[PDB]
Structure formats: C-alpha cells, structure tokens
Amino acid sequence: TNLCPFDEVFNATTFASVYAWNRKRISNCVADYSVLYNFAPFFAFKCYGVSPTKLNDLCFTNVYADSFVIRGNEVSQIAPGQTGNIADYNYKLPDDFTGCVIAWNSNKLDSTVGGNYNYRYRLFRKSKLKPFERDISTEIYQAGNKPCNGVAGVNCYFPLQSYGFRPTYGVGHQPYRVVVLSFELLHAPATVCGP
Amino acid sequence: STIEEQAKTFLDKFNHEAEDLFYQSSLASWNYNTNITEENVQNMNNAGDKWSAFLKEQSTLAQMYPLQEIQNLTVKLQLQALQQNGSSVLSEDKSKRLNTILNTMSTIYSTGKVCNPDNPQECLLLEPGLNEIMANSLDYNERLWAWESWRSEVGKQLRPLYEEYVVLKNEMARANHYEDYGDYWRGDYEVNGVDGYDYSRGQLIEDVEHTFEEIKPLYEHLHAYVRAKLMNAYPSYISPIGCLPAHLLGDMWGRFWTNLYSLTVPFGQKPNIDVTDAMVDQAWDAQRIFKEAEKFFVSVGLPNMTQGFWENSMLTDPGNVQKAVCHPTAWDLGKGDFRILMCTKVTMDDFLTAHHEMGHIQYDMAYAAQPFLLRNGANEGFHEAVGEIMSLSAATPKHLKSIGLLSPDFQEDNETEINFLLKQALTIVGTLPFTYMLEKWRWMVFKGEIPKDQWMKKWWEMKREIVGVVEPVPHDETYCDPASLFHVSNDYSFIRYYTRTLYQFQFQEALCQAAKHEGPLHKCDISNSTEAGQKLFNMLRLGKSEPWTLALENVVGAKNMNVRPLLNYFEPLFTWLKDQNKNSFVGWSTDWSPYA
Ligand SMILES: *[C@@H]1O[C@H](CO)[C@@H](O[C@@H]2O[C@H](CO)[C@@H](O)[C@H](O)[C@H]2NC(C)=O)[C@H](O)[C@H]1NC(C)=O
Ligand SMILES: *[C@@H]1O[C@H](CO)[C@@H](O)[C@H](O)[C@H]1NC(C)=O
Ligand SMILES: *[C@@H]1O[C@H](CO)[C@@H](O)[C@H](O)[C@H]1NC(C)=O
Ligand SMILES: *[C@@H]1O[C@H](CO)[C@@H](O)[C@H](O)[C@H]1NC(C)=O
Ligand SMILES: *[C@@H]1O[C@H](CO)[C@@H](O)[C@H](O)[C@H]1NC(C)=O
Ligand SMILES: [Zn+2]
C-alpha cells in the first residue's frame, strides 16, 4: 500500500561504515525497483539467485537493505564466495545468496580535500565472518603471544582502519555507496510485494 | 603465532598508514612544484616531516622481527627495506655534521657563481650562464675560462667538505655492515636467498668493467673520429694522438657529447629529422601530444591514462603569474593518483619526452598492485630504461610516418642513418666512459685506495686512461673537480646511468624481436605489437617483488646485464667509423696535455 522507503536507504545523507553495515528491514510495502537509478558514474547492478531483469515480480518475506561505503577496488568483493578485507572480516555474502548488489561512485559526497577518515573498515579479525554477521567490537587485536590487555602496542593493533577519502584519489580508491537487497524467503506470508 | 606471522601483520598495518601519509607528502610536493609560493613551501616541509618521522619510528618497530626467521621472500624484502638505519646509526652529533655538509655542498653548487675577470660586477650561475657557454660557444678561451673558473671557485670550497663527507658516509656504511660507502651504494643491485638469481655487490664492479671492455673499440673509434673533426675546429690546440681537452666536449664536464653534433655531423648537407614544423602545421597542442602518447601504449596492449591523470596533471606551463618548476617528472602519488608535470611546448623534443615520462607512469600503474615498499623499479637502472625505450621507438621514422608527422615520401637513406646514429652515440656512447670512470673514482675513494693527497691526481690519470679526456690546466689537490658536478656534491649514485644504458637496449632488442621487426635495431618501432607490450608488462608489474635478475630475464631471456644489444644498435655507425678513421689514429696518449 505504501512505498518502501527506498528513498531513505538510497538517498540518505550519511550511509555507514561497512564493519557496522546498516540494515533497513523492508516489509509490508510496495516495491518499485525501477526507480533505482540515481545516474551515478560507475553504477553496478549484479544480482544473484533472483533475476535482476523484471525484479518487480517476486515476493519475499523481507527485503534487507544493507547499506555502507567501500572503495572501488573492493566493490567486486560484495558477491558470493569472494575474499579480501571486506568480505573476509567486514561484510560477507553467502554462497547461495539470492538478492541484489547496487553500488555507485560517491566521490562527490564522501571525499574531502583534507581527507575523510569517518568511514572505517576492519583490517584484522581473529576469524572469518559468517554470512551476514556483523562485528562492531573494538577488541584490541592480539597478533603475538603476549596478551594485549585492552591497550594497543606491540603486536596489539587497533582492528579498525580509516579510508581517508580525498577527492583527488583514483577510481578504485574512491568511495562507492553499496546497497545490498537481501531477499529472504520463508514459509511466512511474504508481505514484501508490489507492481 | 610465529615471527613471520607477526611481521605479516606489522607490515599490513604499515602498508595502510604508509599509503595514506605518503600521499599527503606527494600532494604537498605537487602543490608546491606547481604553485610555488611561501605557503606551499611550508606544508611540503610539514607533511614530509611527519612522513620522515613516521618511517623513522616504524623502522625501530621492525627490527624486532629478525629476517632469518622469515622465509617468504616477499615479506623479507619489505622488512629489509624497512630496517634500513642510514644516518640514524650515527650519533646525534655526527648525524648532524653530515646533514650540515650535505646541505652546504648542495647550496654551494646550486647557488655557485663566478664573476667576469674583465668585469668584476658581471657574474654567471651554472645555468643559464656557463652551461650556455659550454653548449653554444665554439671559442677556445671562452670555454676554458668557464671550465677552469667553475672548478676553481665552486670546486675549491667543496674539497674540504667532500673529505669530511667521505669520512662520515663511510662510518655510516661500516656501521650498517657495509665495506665502504660505495659498497652501500652497490647494495641496490644485491640479491640473496634465491638460487640461480643471486647477485653479490662485488659482482657489479666485475660486470661493469667486463662490459666496458666490449664498449672500448666502439668508443675508441667515436673518440678518434670526434677528435679528427674537433682538430679541424680548434686547429692549433688539439693533438692527433692525445686526449680531448675537457672543456671542448659540449657541456661543463664531458658527461654527454650531444652538443658536438654541430662540429661532427658526417653529412651536414642532408637534414635532421625535425617534426616540430609539421606539428605546428597540423594545429598540435600538448593535449594532442599526450593523447598520441597515450595511443602508443594502448597499441601495445597497455591501459589508458587514468581519468584522474587528465584532470590533475600539469601538461602546460600555467605561465602568467603562477610559477612552477618546469622540469619534466612523472608522479606516482599512490592511491590510484598518477600525474605528469611537464611544461610542454609544441616541439619534437617535448613530443619524445612526453612518451618518455608517460613510460614512467605506465611502469607505476603496472606495479601499483604490489605492497607499498615494493612499488619501485627492480633496481635503480630499470625505471629510466623503461622511459628511454619509449622515446627510442617513438622517434623512429616508422612511427613518425604512421601518425602523420612525416610524409611517406621522405626516404630513409644510409647517410641520414649515420647522421642519426652519431647524434645518438654522442649522447649515449660518449657518456659510458665518463659514467663508469666517475663512479670508479668514487668507489675507490670510499674504499680507501686513493689517498687524499692523490684525489685529483688519480682523477685526471683515470680521465686520460679511461675516458680519453685531458685537463687543459694542471690541478693540485685543492680542487674537487668531481664535486663540481651535481650528482657528486649532492650525494647520488651515478652507476645507474651506465646500467640504465645497457638495460634499455637489452629491452628494445627483446621487444622488437617479439614484434618480428626485421632490419637494423635502430629502425624499430614497437607500436601495435601486443606481444611486445605483454613481454614488457610482465616485468613492469613485478616492481621490487622479484630480484632484478629475474625481472631482466622475463624481458630478454638472460639473467645478467649485457652489452651486445648496445653494440648491435650502433653497429652501422661502428663499421662506418672504422671506415672514416682509415688513416686517422685510433686511441689516445696519456701524457699529452695542452698546458705543457
Ligand atoms: C639499526 O640500529 C638498531 C639499533 O642499534 C639495530 O638493532 C639493534 O642492534 C644491536 C646490535 O648490537 C642489538 O644488540 C639490538 O638487540 C638490536 N635491537 C634493538 C631493538 O636495539 C639494528 O640491527 C640496526 N639495523 C641494521 C640494518 O644494522
Ligand atoms: C534526498 O534528500 C534531499 C534532502 O531531503 C532532497 O533534497 C533530495 O531530493 C532527495 N533525493 C531524492 C528524493 O531522490
Ligand atoms: C608470500 O605471501 C604472499 C601474500 O602474503 C603469498 O601470496 C605468497 O604465496 C607467499 N609466498 C610463499 C612462498 O608462500
Ligand atoms: C581506452 O580507450 C578506448 C577508446 O576509447 C576504450 O575503448 C577503452 O575501454 C579504454 N580502456 C579502458 C580500460 O576502459
Ligand atoms: C596558487 O597560487 C596562486 C597565486 O598565484 C593563488 O592565487 C591560488 O590560490 C593558489 N592555489 C590555491 C589552490 O590556493
Ligand atoms: Zn625519466
């Protein structure tokens, strides 16, 4: 009956850091996936399991609009069965993933000549991330054999690094605004529909 | 958790903070060089000072991961380059004397002036003063005056400094487990731990001299021919069997003979190839020059200039008020940002240089995938050889005909081929004995073989014996003639210019063969041969991750520096030189001198 707040997630004013990837739960609303184009210079629309063509057909129990920012080189990592710092430790997608991945260059919005260190990723983590897990802990990462005692130092590195986006960077080091659309499908009424 | 693993994570954190800080220093050096003001100068010092104090800090945290317990050679190289102490290993007093000396010598040279004897008000800097005399004048005493004054005013001050400079630089080297400062300088070429590709620092001296033996016949003929033509231009002054006076070689020192082409051109009636006039006719700007240059690399299968490159680069002098340093350089700021700073006029010189500097950019883009500390040429001589083989192919008649700058009706006759090869040999061949000898004299000064009371004596002894060049005025040990050259009083290794020369012809002969070029090697144009760009690329992407011996083999199929390609490129001139010297004297005498 009401339009899903695709305006909210895709427009926004700030998005997230990928380690704290921000999920909007979409339910009981009409989906109009055809509006999803903001005319961005390096737009991507890969979709797995489901078919991106005619995406306004299939109902689902929920539609999880996960949103965050990563640099262009790492955009390819937002896909089933990938590797690298983003998929390893920050935001993993499952093997049989059945949603959509929608990124777009945002150098306009998130860079700064002095450098924008607000967006973070997770450089080190003791284990690989299970699909759709989120790590937001600031546990001082122990790399050596002496305990770290919650303070950084030798072999005790803070696990979060800043991107430092500047407008003079390159295409692969520039901030891209990813939006995943995770299509859950349970035994439920599957309220998320709409032509 | 082992120590190789802790080193992995230590470098992983370093690789991300180093990339972020090195960028700010690079973009602070960029904004100064493009916009010289007294605000930019301050910040270039700032971001550099944080960077020089971040590397210095990180060096100490790295010493804790011993190399012998790291088995991944990729990790070993990063740790080894990060554990470099350098001047740090000297005391806070001696580490201060050295930087006072280096700053004093650099300023004495770059600000050195000599004032007219007839006119003690008029003075001249090295540029655009005395260097303007050395290049364009053909008077004898006008040249001798500048040559002798520059080495007796600037040189005599630098002598006591260079004596202390040698002492401290050795102490720094011996503290970092190096024989002398020269041994420290030859560590650039060293390889360890990779069987079949190892290389010791002593092997460089063996290689450099062994190859130079094969150069000697070609040089003794270029020397004898040039001497004959010079003897006809300075009749009373030049002997037919003795060395060339050092002030008649085209520059202040004799480094390059390029300026003697006016006096030595074999077939002066036939013209030089100069597409400057043709570029003007067709309405060419610097935009076109780099676009055509970008097209050349795309033809061999290399990528296009990044979308940021065109937006941010300085391809023309902004002129007017905003001043700059116009010296052409290729900037790898990192984080995907690549730029060229070039004040480009529409000539042929700047057409070839744009190909040369963009060759550096292509190398930088190729190895950008590597870790931070491994983003550099395999050794020092690699990076410049990559740029020079781009101007090699782009300057040929074949490439100029295929872009519309030379009419398909101009015909390549053997006399112009000799005209071409000589003007190449003056620059390229003539510098090899100057370069090898100069770094030989520095190597021996550091190693202790030449006493202080013999410095200038063994210099001019080797100038006569190796370079085949003689001083016009006898010099005691209060001169420092090597110090009057930039690279010597500013602490730069010079052997790279010898190795770079031999490397570039090895590449060109290996690329042109993969391009199925048939004919003399000096006619080749690697354009449109993707097989050639592939072969070059597989070395470019390595950077420092592989030993320079392996990288050289992935292009030419040989593990070590060779000279046969350089001779092969110059062979048509070689036999023509053996002809024109039929009744001249080939060789020189080491006790002739114009000063009696
Ligand atoms: C750079 O200098 C450091 C500091 O002296 C060297 O590391 C020390 O070397 C001494 C040699 O006697 C050892 O006793 C120390 O245990 C070392 N470690 C520390 C933390 O002091 C380092 O070896 C030098 N680097 C090179 C390449 O020589
Ligand atoms: C995004 O929000 C801003 C501020 O509310 C608004 O001006 C803009 O039109 C929005 N973009 C849309 C709705 O596409
Ligand atoms: C060294 O490490 C790199 C990356 O850490 C890895 O790709 C490579 O295989 C390692 N080398 C060896 C010999 O294991
Ligand atoms: C290089 O330019 C050509 C011509 O416009 C273009 O087709 C090609 O896609 C460009 N290279 C890349 C990697 O995009
Ligand atoms: C570059 O220098 C000029 C002075 O000629 C100045 O007006 C300009 O503001 C400088 N650039 C920037 C980005 O400030
Ligand atoms: Zn260069």
Author numbering:
A (entry chain B): 333 to 527
B (entry chain A): 19 to 614
Relevant lines from the article:
Receptor binding and immune escape have been recognized as two major drivers for the evolution of receptor-binding domain (RBD) of the viral spike (S) protein, which is responsible for receptor recognition. Receptor binding is a key step for SARS-CoV-2 infection. In this study, we evaluated the binding properties of BF.7, BQ.1, BQ.1.1, XBB and XBB.1.5 RBDs to human ACE2 (hACE2) and determined the cryo-EM structures of hACE2 in complex with BF.7, BQ.1, BQ.1.1, XBB and XBB.1.5 RBDs, respectively. As previously reported, the binding interface of SARS-CoV-2 RBD in complex with ACE2 was divided into two patches.
Moreover, the crystal structures of BF.7 and BQ.1.1 RBD binding to hACE2 were also solved at resolutions of 3.46 and 3.40 Å, respectively, for detailed molecular interactions. In addition, BQ.1 is another descendant of BA.5 sub-variant, which has gained K444T, N460K mutations compared to BA.5, and has evolved into BQ.1.1 and BQ.1.1.18 by gaining R346T substitution. BQ.1 (KD = 19.07 ± 4.08 nM), BQ.1.1 (KD = 14.70 ± 0.37 nM) and BF.7 (KD = 13.37 ± 0.29 nM) S proteins to hACE2 are comparable to that of BA.4/5 (KD = 14.37 ± 0.41 nM). The side chain of F486, V486 and P486 point to the α1 and α2 helixes of hACE2. Though the side chain of V486 is shorter than that of F486, V486 is also a hydrophobic amino acid that can interact with the hydrophobic amino acids, L79 and M82, in the hACE2 through van der Waals force (VDW).
